[PDB]
């Protein structure tokens, strides 16, 4: 997250860190949303590599013991059957990860609240991005969970030529584009939390930024639209 502020420990308890096994170490690669005690929602592209993955819940500082973490292996990965590595701009950037164990819920570990199917927000809807991603374009990861106020940019505007044009589909959410705050590498697969009827719900799964840079004016961060996928999500979980 470029232009973030440090999150409070208990603000976003559905955020996980998706990590891969790197020599003898575990490195952060993506964010995710805990949507059941045994199911994580992330981006497809974050599990295109055949790595050994683990999920960390209750995580605040990547490099310290917070006293709150639970570290859980991934037992099954279900990517959207339409996902194509070679075409992010097509969409379907979403995956469900089944956890080897159920986690325990507490004030650091909760489930993310999903939108009703078909829900579109109005332009300029108040949402936050959260993540341990790069804090500058070509920068480094954050140690602590960053948050950024990232208001939505409607389809009509986002698809217009000055903005993303044709690259963005109506199965996506655009948020931000001010030149100052954005998603950046390592935020991918995480949440976009938006305030609807007094409740934060997870509307977006972070998917891409511009090739020219993370924080680029009139290139909002682009998210998979979760509300486009509710029947898919539900069908996966009922049947595994
Ligand atoms: Ca920690």
Curated annotation (Swiss-Prot):
Disulphide linkage map: 30-46, 127-194, 158-174, 184-214
Physiological role: Serine proteases that hydrolyze many proteins in addition to elastin.
GO terms classed as biological process: proteolysis
SUPFAM superfamilies: Trypsin-like serine proteases (SSF50494)
E.C. no: 3.4.21.36
Gene source species: Sus scrofa (Pig)
CDD domains associated with the record: Tryp_SPc
Reactions catalysed: Hydrolysis of proteins, including elastin. Preferential cleavage: Ala-|-Xaa
Main location: secreted
Protein name, as recorded: Chymotrypsin-like elastase family member 1
Residue ranges of every copy of the Peptidase S1 domain listed in the record: 1-238
PROSITE patterns: TRYPSIN_DOM, TRYPSIN_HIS, TRYPSIN_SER
Co-factor note (free text): Binds 1 Ca(2+) ion per subunit.
Pfam family, one: Trypsin
Keywords: Calcium, Disulfide bond, Hydrolase, Metal-binding, Protease, Secreted, Serine protease, Signal, Zymogen
Underlying gene: CELA1
GO cellular component, one term: extracellular space
Tissue-level expression: Pancreas. Basal layers of the epidermis, hair follicle and sebaceous gland epithelia (at protein level).
Family label: Belongs to the peptidase S1 family. Elastase subfamily.
KW Signal (keyword) present: yes
Binding site for Ca(2+): 59, 61, 64, 69
EC class (word): hydrolase
């Amino acid at each position: 997250v470029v232009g973030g502020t440090e999150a409070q420990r208990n603000s976003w308890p559905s955020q996980i860190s998706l990590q891969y096994r790197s020599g003898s170490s575990w490195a952060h690669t993506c964010g995710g949303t805990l949507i059941r005690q045994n199911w994580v929602m992330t981006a497809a592209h974050c599990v295109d590599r055949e790595l050994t993955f683990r999920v960390v819940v209750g995580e605040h500082n990547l490099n310290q013991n917070n006293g709150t973490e639970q570290y859980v292996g991934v037992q099954k990965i279900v990517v959207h059957p339409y996902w194509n590595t070679d075409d992010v701009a097509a969409g379907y950037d979403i995956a469900l990860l089944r956890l080897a164990q159920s986690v325990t819920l507490n004030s650091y570990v909760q489930l993310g609240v999903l939108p009703r199917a078909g829900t579109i927000l109005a332009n300029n809807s108040p949402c936050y991005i959260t993540g341990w991603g790069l804090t500058r374009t070509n920068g480094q990861l954050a140690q602590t969970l960053q948050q950024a106020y990232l208001p939505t940019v409607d389809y009509a505007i986002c698809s217009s030529s000055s903005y993303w044009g044709s690259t963005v589909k109506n199965s996506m959410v655009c948020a931000g584009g001010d030149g100052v705050r954005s998603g950046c590498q390592g935020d991918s697969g995480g949440p976009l939390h938006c305030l609807v009827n007094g409740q934060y719900a997870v509307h977006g799964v972070t998917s891409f930024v511009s090739r020219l840079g993370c924080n680029v004016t009139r290139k909002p961060t682009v998210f998979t639209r979760v509300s486009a996928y509710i029947s898919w999500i539900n069908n996966v979980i009922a049947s595994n």
